[PDB]
Amino acid sequence: HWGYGKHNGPEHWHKDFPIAKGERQSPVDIDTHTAKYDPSLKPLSVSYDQATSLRILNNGHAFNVEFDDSQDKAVLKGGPLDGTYRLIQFHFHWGSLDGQGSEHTVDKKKYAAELHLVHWNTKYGDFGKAVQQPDGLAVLGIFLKVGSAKPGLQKVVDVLDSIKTKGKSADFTNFDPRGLLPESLDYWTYPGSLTTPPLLECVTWIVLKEPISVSSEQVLKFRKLNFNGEGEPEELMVDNWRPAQPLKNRQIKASFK
Ligand SMILES: CCCSc1ccc(S(N)(=O)=O)cc1
Ligand SMILES: CCCSc1ccc(S(N)(=O)=O)cc1
Ligand SMILES: [Zn+2]
């Protein structure tokens, strides 16, 4: 099965998921000088006041914090979007070292990690139908740099020891994802894909310019997770990022400057 190793990592994915070589794959390098300021872009509207987290899961690739998406509760709208997108889960990608881990890059800069808040377009009724559509998902991407701790992250960090290995889950209620946002909602946007198999070309990417800071100790705890299941040989969950893919026929637009 696919993963992030030498034998099953990003360069192999195309053999099971040939869309890996498609026309709108993610992530990409954001060349900030060539990104077009678009005065028609609206402010992003992030409405997470009624978000209801339920559980956190080690899926063998990353961990997902899941939300009840059965009502209209935690929604993303505006920005480049038409319509209303409901939060279903967030997860991260991170490195073995502070100098790598993000999926998107900014003028070839890698960040230590990248947060993905995944939302599906309510016009398609549920997530599984949304991923079959070109405007099915909106993923809000936020870079992480190492510096001062992110206090709103610590509840996630502390639960990680209970989901160390593939397939473990733990109740995770009352987690407020507003505590993971930077101060500014200035962003870049472009059309792309899921960054893991099945690599479906269903995502409007919205990547915030301002990173959040997390501490060295917080990222260290991400790196103690394991890609293996309980009772199998330990493989630290590190370097679970896909490298930048060809931009092909796409324009990255900026909401700012
Ligand atoms: C059960 C592991 C078989 S080896 C292998 C299987 C699948 C992949 S893929 N194309 O990355 O999904 C890569 C390596
Ligand atoms: C369709 C099953 C995969 S769900 C899924 C896979 C990848 C992402 S990502 N890393 O945000 O593009 C978001 C959701
Ligand atoms: Zn992701």
Tokens of 209: 């310019």
CA-to-CA distance for 111 and 117, rounded, in angstroms? Answer: 17
Q: Name the nearest CA neighbour of 135 among 77, 209, 66.
A: 77
* CA-based nearest residue to 207, from 222, 188, 183: 188
Rounded to the nearest angstrom, the gap between the alpha carbon of residue 86 and the centroid of all alpha carbons in its chain is 15
- Domain residue limits at 109: 1-257
Residues 85 and 152: their CA atoms lie apart, in Å, by 23
Catalytically active residues are 61
* CB atoms inside a 10 Å sphere around CB 174: 10
What sections of 61-215 are H helices per DSSP?
Answer: 127-130, 154-159
Task: Determine if ligand 2 sits within 6 Å of the CB of residue 89.
Answer: no
Per-residue DSSP letter, 18 = G
- Nearby residues of 88 by Cβ (< 8 Å), 6 or more positions away: 66, 67, 69, 118, 119, 120, 127
Instruction: Answer positive or negative: Cα dihedral of 82, 83, 87, 88.
Output: negative
Name the domain count of the chain.
1
Out of 28, 195, 205, give the residue to mutate to test ligand 2, the one with the largest number of ligand atoms within 8 Å of its CB: 195
Q: Would you state the structure tokens that stand for residue 144, as one six-digit string?
A: 């992480």
- Report the C-alpha gap between 130 and 115 in whole angstroms: 21
Coil, strand, or helix at residue 101?
coil
How far apart are the C-alpha atoms of 79 and 135, rounded to whole Å?
14
Provide CB contacts within 8 A for 254, sequence distance 6+.
32, 35, 36, 37, 38, 41, 186, 187, 188
Q: Is the CB of 8 under 6 A from ligand 1?
A: yes
Q: Identify the experimental approach.
A: X-ray
3-class secondary structure, 183: coil
Alpha carbon 42 to chain centroid, angstroms: 22
Which of 226, 211, 104, 212 lies closest to 153 in space, CA to CA? 212
Largest CA distance in the chain: 54
User: CA nearest 205: which of 131, 106, 138, 120?
Assistant: 138
Q: Which helix (H) or strand (E) holds 217?
A: helix 216-222
Does residue 91 have a known ligand-binding role? yes
Tokens representing 111 are 């960040």
Residues within 5 Å of ion ligand 3, judged at the Cβ atom: 116
Residue 125: C-alpha distances to residues 30, 35, 122, 131 (Å): 32, 33, 5, 11
Task: Please report the atom of ligand 1 found closest to the CA of residue 12.
Answer: 11
CA separation for the pair 189, 206 (Å, rounded):
5
**Nearest CA, atom 5, ligand 1:** 1
Question: Residue 37's domain is classified under what CATH number?
Answer: 3.10.200.10
What is the Å distance from ligand 2's center to 193 Cα?
8
Residue 158 class from Cβ within 10 Å (0-12 exposed, 13-18 middle, 19+ buried)?
A: exposed
d(C-alpha 218, C-alpha 156), whole Å:
9
Q: Count the Cβ atoms, other than its own, within 10 Å of residue 64.
A: 21
Resolution (A): 1.1
Residue 41 has phi, psi (to 5 degrees) of -70, 140
Helix (H, G, I), strand (E, B) or coil at 120: strand
Residues 149, 218, 102, 110, CA torsion sign? positive
Pocket mutation for ligand 1, best pick of 4, 6, 7, 8 (most atoms within 8 Å of C-beta): 8
Residue 152 to residues 142, 156, 176, 181: CA-CA distances in angstroms? 14, 8, 8, 9
